[PDB]
Amino acid sequence: KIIHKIIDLGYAKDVDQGELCTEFVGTLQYLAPELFENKPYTATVDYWSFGTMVFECIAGYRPFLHHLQPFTWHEKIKKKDPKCIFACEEMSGEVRFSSH
Amino acid sequence: GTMVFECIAGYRPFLHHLQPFTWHEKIKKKDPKCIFACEEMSGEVRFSSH
């Protein structure tokens, strides 16, 4: 059977000798909106990364605006309705939200 | 000035291809004596006077 395994922690944070490792990363797309403000983050930051992928592993794309740079891919869902787990763009460029 | 910069980098002194219509509202602030401002891989925007 296929065995999934996490890898590379040259970015992950800890508590012992060596708080954090690096601030920014590369072509972000799957990360909690915490590090996007450099403000006091939490330990739940991982839950988001995992969740987002789980969604994609069912739909085949991001839980919000796919192929849309996280720059604006944020402000558009900044509020992101409660319990919402999806938000694509209608054929007319419109934006639709949904918790289904 | 703008050209001199490009003659060293190979592109605009700020945002490349980014039409001037929205190009200004993005560099209107421009740090004290800034001469560069591209867009990160994540579409983000970064400024620099180097």
UniProtKB/Swiss-Prot annotation, chain B:
Q: What does this protein do?
A: Serine kinase that plays an essential role in the NF-kappa-B signaling pathway which is activated by multiple stimuli such as inflammatory cytokines, bacterial or viral products, DNA damages or other cellular stresses. Acts as a part of the canonical IKK complex in the conventional pathway of NF-kappa-B activation and phosphorylates inhibitors of NF-kappa-B on serine residues. These modifications allow polyubiquitination of the inhibitors and subsequent degradation by the proteasome.
Q: In which tissues is it expressed?
A: Widely expressed.
The family this protein is said to belong to: Belongs to the protein kinase superfamily. Ser/Thr protein kinase family. I-kappa-B kinase subfamily.
Please give the clinical condition linked to this protein.
Cocoon syndrome: A lethal syndrome characterized by multiple fetal malformations including defective face and seemingly absent limbs, which are bound to the trunk and encased under the skin.
Modification(s) after translation: Phosphorylated by MAP3K14/NIK, AKT and to a lesser extent by MEKK1, and dephosphorylated by PP2A. Autophosphorylated. Ubiquitinated by TRIM56 via 'Lys-63'-linked ubiquitination, promoting activation of CHUK/IKKA.
Indicate the quaternary assembly.
Answer: Component of the I-kappa-B-kinase (IKK) core complex consisting of CHUK, IKBKB and IKBKG; probably four alpha/CHUK-beta/IKBKB dimers are associated with four gamma/IKBKG subunits. The IKK core complex seems to associate with regulatory or adapter proteins to form a IKK-signalosome holo-complex. The IKK complex associates with TERF2IP/RAP1, leading to promote IKK-mediated phosphorylation of RELA/p65. Part of a complex composed of NCOA2, NCOA3, CHUK/IKKA, IKBKB, IKBKG and CREBBP. Part of a 70-90 kDa complex at least consisting of CHUK/IKKA, IKBKB, NFKBIA, RELA, ELP1 and MAP3K14. (Microbial infection) Interacts with InlC of Listeria monocytogenes.
UniProt lineage: Eukaryota, Metazoa, Chordata, Craniata, Vertebrata
Q: What is known of its domains?
A: The kinase domain is located in the N-terminal region. The leucine zipper is important to allow homo- and hetero-dimerization. At the C-terminal region is located the region responsible for the interaction with NEMO/IKBKG.
Disulfide bridges in this chain: none
For this entry, the protein name equals Inhibitor of nuclear factor kappa-B kinase subunit alpha
